[PDB]
Amino acid sequence: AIAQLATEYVFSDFLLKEPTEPKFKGLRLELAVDKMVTCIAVGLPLLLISLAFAQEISIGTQISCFSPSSFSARQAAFVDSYCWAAVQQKNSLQSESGNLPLWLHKFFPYILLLFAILLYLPPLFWRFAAAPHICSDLKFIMEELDKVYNRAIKAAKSARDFKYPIVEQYLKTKKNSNNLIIKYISCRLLTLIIILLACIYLGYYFSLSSLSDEFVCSIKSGILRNDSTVPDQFQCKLIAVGIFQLLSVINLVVYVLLAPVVVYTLFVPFRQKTDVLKVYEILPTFDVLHFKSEGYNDLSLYNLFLEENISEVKSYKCLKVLENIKSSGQGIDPMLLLTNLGMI
Amino acid sequence: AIAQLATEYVFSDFLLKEPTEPKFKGLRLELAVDKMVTCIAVGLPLLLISLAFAQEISIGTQISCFSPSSFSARQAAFVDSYCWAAVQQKNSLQSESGNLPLWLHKFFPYILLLFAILLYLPPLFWRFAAAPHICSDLKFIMEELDKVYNRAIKAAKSARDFKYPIVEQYLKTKKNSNNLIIKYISCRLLTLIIILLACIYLGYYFSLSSLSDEFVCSIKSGILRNDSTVPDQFQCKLIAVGIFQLLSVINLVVYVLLAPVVVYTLFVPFRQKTDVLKVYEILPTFDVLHFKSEGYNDLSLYNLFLEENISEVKSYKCLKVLENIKSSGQGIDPMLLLTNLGMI
Amino acid sequence: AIAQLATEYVFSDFLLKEPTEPKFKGLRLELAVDKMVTCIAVGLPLLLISLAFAQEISIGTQISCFSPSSFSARQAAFVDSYCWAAVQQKNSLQSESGNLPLWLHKFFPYILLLFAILLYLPPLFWRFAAAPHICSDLKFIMEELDKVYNRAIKAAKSARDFKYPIVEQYLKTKKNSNNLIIKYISCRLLTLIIILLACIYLGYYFSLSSLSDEFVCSIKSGILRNDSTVPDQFQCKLIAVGIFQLLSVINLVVYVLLAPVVVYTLFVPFRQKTDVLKVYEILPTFDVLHFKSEGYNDLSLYNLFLEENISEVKSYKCLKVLENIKSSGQGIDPMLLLTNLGMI
Amino acid sequence: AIAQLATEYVFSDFLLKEPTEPKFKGLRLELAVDKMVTCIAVGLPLLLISLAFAQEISIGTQISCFSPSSFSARQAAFVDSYCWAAVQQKNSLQSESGNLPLWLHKFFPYILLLFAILLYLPPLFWRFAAAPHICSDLKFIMEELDKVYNRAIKAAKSARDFKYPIVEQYLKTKKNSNNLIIKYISCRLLTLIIILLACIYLGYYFSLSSLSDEFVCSIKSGILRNDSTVPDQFQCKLIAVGIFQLLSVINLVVYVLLAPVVVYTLFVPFRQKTDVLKVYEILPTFDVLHFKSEGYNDLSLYNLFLEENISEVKSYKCLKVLENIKSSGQGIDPMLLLTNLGMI
Amino acid sequence: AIAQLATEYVFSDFLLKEPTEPKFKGLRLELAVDKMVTCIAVGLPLLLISLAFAQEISIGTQISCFSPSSFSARQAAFVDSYCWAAVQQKNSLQSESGNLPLWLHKFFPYILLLFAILLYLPPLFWRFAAAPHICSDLKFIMEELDKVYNRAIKAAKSARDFKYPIVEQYLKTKKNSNNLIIKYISCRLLTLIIILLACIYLGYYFSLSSLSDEFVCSIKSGILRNDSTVPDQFQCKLIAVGIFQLLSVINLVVYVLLAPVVVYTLFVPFRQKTDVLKVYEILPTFDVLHFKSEGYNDLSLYNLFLEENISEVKSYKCLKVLENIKSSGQGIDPMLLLTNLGMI
Ligand SMILES: *[C@@H]1O[C@H](CO)[C@@H](O)[C@H](O)[C@H]1NC(C)=O
Ligand SMILES: *[C@@H]1O[C@H](CO)[C@@H](O)[C@H](O)[C@H]1NC(C)=O
Ligand SMILES: *[C@@H]1O[C@H](CO)[C@@H](O)[C@H](O)[C@H]1NC(C)=O
Ligand SMILES: *[C@@H]1O[C@H](CO)[C@@H](O)[C@H](O)[C@H]1NC(C)=O
Ligand SMILES: *[C@@H]1O[C@H](CO)[C@@H](O)[C@H](O)[C@H]1NC(C)=O
């Protein structure tokens, strides 16, 4: 049913499942824009395939050949099945557009599934090769930030009654290596390349004459060759090709809307904005240094992932509360922090 | 079965699922009127699609063409499938109303599913882009309110035997920025625009002549062109078009009933009523200031979400009990609060 | 449906299920490259089998025989079923390519399933015969590493206020025996051999004339032998053989892309890189000795499995944080370790 | 679908389910070679049955009879069903090979299911009659070994700062009785006998003429006896008999590969190797005596089950670590044990 | 599918489900031989019913009637359905064997299901009427035995540093009443009676002429009586009657193998063996008296249930360890018990 496919592929959490494992607990490991690009680019061809053969849009078989009236029902079934299998054998069928449109019309679901798989591959490579590396580091950074917050408020609480910037040094180190960022821009670049190839294929397929689904087929190989009761050629038509073209144009539109999103995603430093650690600079136990910007290096990627997963950090939440209050400038940062009383 | 679709789409918790995650625990993050508008505007086209092809309302195929009596059963099947695929090819079919009604009749389920998806998109954008931002802030506000209540009753209990309005300052800050409110009114405005476009389309479709489902179809392209045994044209009829129109008028009625609800939702300040924090003004540890009204700013949105999710706050419940008792004015607020004894 | 098979075999965690048992908790026991090689080499033939008979690619029966017009529908069904069963009996059918292509065309799904099973067998033998042996040892090594880290920081903490390298001696012992490594390279070698045999078979099958699916069949054994109403021979065609060849070439391409991966996996010492225990050499309670390289011995296999599962080790994570910071060389290892304060 | 059966019967944990009960927690109670022999010998005939009627290998009905052209479709259906039911009634059908091949061709799935059930029976008898007896004893032995290890390290720890070999005496007692071992070799012997009978049957069935699936059938009992419009005899063919023979040869090959495994399993003392308790002899609280070898007695069976389930024993793991280190002979057993510090 | 039924009815835990309730936790309440007799006698007729209509053994309809060639397909369908419904109306059909074989052939699945239900009834009556009574008593006896063991080892431990035989008196009381034992032998006797009636019916049914499935049927009641186009009588055959007889002989064989098992089960005192409480006689806190044998009284039934469920009792396990060691006679019972140190 149409509504079942709708639920399964947009309303269900299709490709939105969090990693079912206690290693990454609440950690996203895939940027929201990347998760939605993957969800679209993968589920749309699948949702389109499932639509193209919805039981109410499909009239029946995928091909019909119009055997003569003298032919029996089984003889007609042979002609249909033969021509269906004969869209490959170029000698049997004669089509005005060519044999390539026939191949594309028969194997359109396979090609869409191929595009879905190829578009799922880069997110899978990211989830397996580079997601744990960033997950461990991000979990460690969040733990260290919570610890420095607790120590800062404990020092402030003792005042109301070591000191090494380890996380800052770790991020300074991340500023050097660029392995994770080249992995990220490589998976994004393969996603963009596959999306553009899919756009090219879908634009070509939609550009077909729309009469290329009608091909002349001749069951005259083998012992049927010199047979006389069988006519020389049959007029076959590939049903559901109009549906294929109408769905291919939808896929092409969505993909050419998605390609600018991927291209923008490709520029990872430009997206690093609203410096997340700047809110921590108001802590005594934390050095006054953001030092996170301007590079095609893993530091920018970590900045993005921190900007995403930082809302889970309670210390960040309270510090951002104080920072927003500081916009008015009524009281003072350490006083409001001591008032806070939120170690964990 | 009809009853299965009924269960799935009204009696089941379709699109009423709470976010399956411990980040938002009992927090709604979608106003009840917005949740019901989404549920209706999305499930109604899906429920209608599933109805339009219920096994007891569908007689069989979606098209029937009445081939001549001389035609074999397979030859008749070819005519049916050809004309079904030929509602697209404008050269083959001749219809009094035009080819556009034929397109709309064949692809009515697809268009309804498209409307369902487009109507689901703004709630999805709200759930992903702006729901966590409001969720963290609302959870922090509820925690701070419980904390101030506990501190107030502890001070009162010590009397029977810091002091910074942090949440008030946070809300004062929210009064300034308007990012969340423009996100909210933007998703609501896209919902209204898509609902109005769906109303326009459904009113047009229902306005079709009701004989536009009968079209004359000619299987005479290719080698069949100069064939003589095949008649010049066939009288095809698109079954289940009357069902499509009867369901389109239902969808249009429900949508023109839903559009005023969305328009009213669009006026977020007007809906901010029954000042929820006013009940907290009777606490000594809480400054005597509501300061939440009159603006197209995120403060009004936060007021709505607080009015919704505030029933989960135990301190709010007890304070509202005292406030309602105060209507009689028998005793006194601090005495009844000390009697209360409900820290958590 | 195509999309259902897509989900089940690429988007679902097919053959990615962690061992459902508390004996191995978070331990991989299968290298990521080996897990992906198994997933591909097993799920691809299964995904291809399921595709080759997707309800929208299949026109109907797998064989059609074109009985004469005088034959009844049941008589035609007998001819079809007889020839289907007669691709085996070499006396009945006469084919230009031979009877072997006919056998291969009828039993192509069985042969692909056979290849899937044979390719699943070596990973199963590894999971049952050699996975627990390495699992117990790896869990013990991780526990001992966490213990030595805790003891080192406790000694450092006492300074701020036994001693036997047991794990080093255990690994030195592993350096001697080679049972696990010969088991590993044997399962990998059988995987490579079966992949190459599958490549050979698929390249042969795809090389078939593409007209070998058309065979002449004669229902003239038994009492039908001297019967006259039945014609001498029927022109049968095996539908879905073009689909079989198009899928066999896909399987062959993926398999010849997979074979270099298996060959590279076969060289286990070469893959032992980024010495994982080198990060532990900065501990006083740990002897300054890596001693893990250069051999076709179980030590290299354990090095690979440690490199994989070591991210679960918290002590390793903190030590790698200190080691990366040491790249700048600002402070000192024991001071930063004492600052760390992460016993568990 | 083929791939569904593949998953269910090889890739799923079919007959690999651990006993769903807290009485045996992590205890195997079935030797790995016995578990795999059972899995193969049971799932292979089931997997073969499911294959023999895969929707893409089955052309349709299991029998086709070729009624005359004058016969109606229902009259043809009567002939087919009559002959299908008439492979039993020996008077009606005349076959060159005999009626026994016809019986075997009709009831091949039943015979394979019968073999699967009979092969599942001995493992079931072992799981119910003799598995709890060995489970309680093995759990007690593991608990006693952990206890003696704890006591030995506690005595060693007190030195760094009763005494009855109960488990040794228990095993000495097991050395006497042979009830469990005769139960084990009896279930293995019945498994071997049933496997050999299945090999004999499958080798016979595969040896059929391959034209025994074509039998002449005569619907001429009752009032049809002297009827004239009905022909004297019909040429029926049992479709899917070639598939049955091709699957029977596969089953026979796998079974004659499995029979040597069962025969080797039958020699339980020979398999008792790598004396597991020898690693415990380095404990002071444990007497220096293995005393486990050379007998057709329950002690050898317990030795096998201990060798299997001993990896779950933590004390055994640590002791084996020390024993492997002792191969180099650098330090000393009690010193390394005291260093160990792994009571539980 | 055959393999699905195989899994469901032998390989699944069909009728082996433990009582899903915390009242009986690990308590069997059904003797293993009784559980297996129930499983066989109930699942075998169900497994046989499911086999008799496996989609690959069923050719199609259950009856075929061979209407004349002039009859239309719908007219043939009327004859088939009429005769199917007319095996009851004795006036319409004329069969050589009689109308009773026809009744038995049509309703064979119903009769097998009836036998399955009647054979399930006595185990159900036992599970509901007499299982809780024995469950409470057995749980109390096990608790009292664990308590007396704990007290005995505590007295022995105090020596190394009340007294009423309550459970012995309870069992002495059980020796008097015979309600549970007459309930048990009554359910077993009804099981045996129903098994013997099923054997009689199946032996009769299998003894049918095997041509009793062919009956002459006449659709000539009502307005068809004096009609002329309809022939006087039709030759109908009940397909799948040979399958019914082949399955009935299997059921009869299994049932005549099962009946001796039930008869042996009927002799409950004879089965009371290996006196389970004899192992407790070596406790000082336990009187030296077995006092459990020789009677058609509830004590023998309790002895059987204790022999079954006693392996769950830890104290029994340790005491049996000491008793087996006592076979050698090396040490002494109280010394080894004090060494034991297993209170719970
Ligand atoms: C069919 O007849 C034609 C007559 O020209 C001949 O060339 C051809 O070889 C024949 N083919 C077969 C299959 O007999
Ligand atoms: C069919 O015959 C007509 C006769 O006017 C001719 O114009 C047309 O080209 C023919 N088409 C084919 C397919 O032969
Ligand atoms: C069929 O007739 C031919 C005539 O030559 C004869 O050789 C053959 O034995 C006959 N077969 C049967 C089944 O009667
Ligand atoms: C059929 O006719 C034959 C003629 O010989 C006769 O022997 C036989 O008894 C008849 N059977 C029936 C059913 O009338
Ligand atoms: C059918 O015709 C016969 C002629 O003898 C007559 O006896 C009988 O009553 C008729 N039945 C009906 C239904 O008219």
Describe this structure in words.
This is part of a larger assembly, with 5 copies of chain A (344 residues). With 344 residues, the first copy, chain A, is mainly alpha-helical. Helices cover 60% and strands 4% of the residues of chain A. Chain A has 12 helices and 4 strands. Chain A has a 4-stranded antiparallel beta sheet, with helices on one face. In chain A, α7 (179-206) packs across α10 (298-309). The longest helix of chain A has 53 residues, at 108-160. Chain A is elongated, with a radius of gyration of 30 Å. The structure holds 2-acetamido-2-deoxy-beta-D-glucopyranose (5 copies). The site of one 2-acetamido-2-deoxy-beta-D-glucopyranose (NAG) has 3 residues of chain E, from loops.
Task: Give the class of chain A from helix and strand content and strand pairing.
Answer: mainly alpha
Largest interface: A-B, 64 and 66 residues
For the biggest β-sheet of chain A, the strand order reads 1-4-3-2
Percent of residues in helices of chain A comes to 55-70%
Secondary structure tally: strands of chain A: 4
Largest beta-sheet characterization of chain A: 4 strands, antiparallel
Percentage beta strand of chain A: under 5%
For the terminal residues of chain A, how far apart are their CA atoms?
49 Å
How many H/I helical runs of chain A?
A: 12
Catalogue the ligands: 2-acetamido-2-deoxy-beta-D-glucopyranose
Quaternary: part of a larger assembly
Radius of gyration of chain A: 30 Å
Q: What pattern of helices and strands is seen along the backbone of chain A? A: HHEHEHHHHEEHHHHH
Outline of chain A: elongated
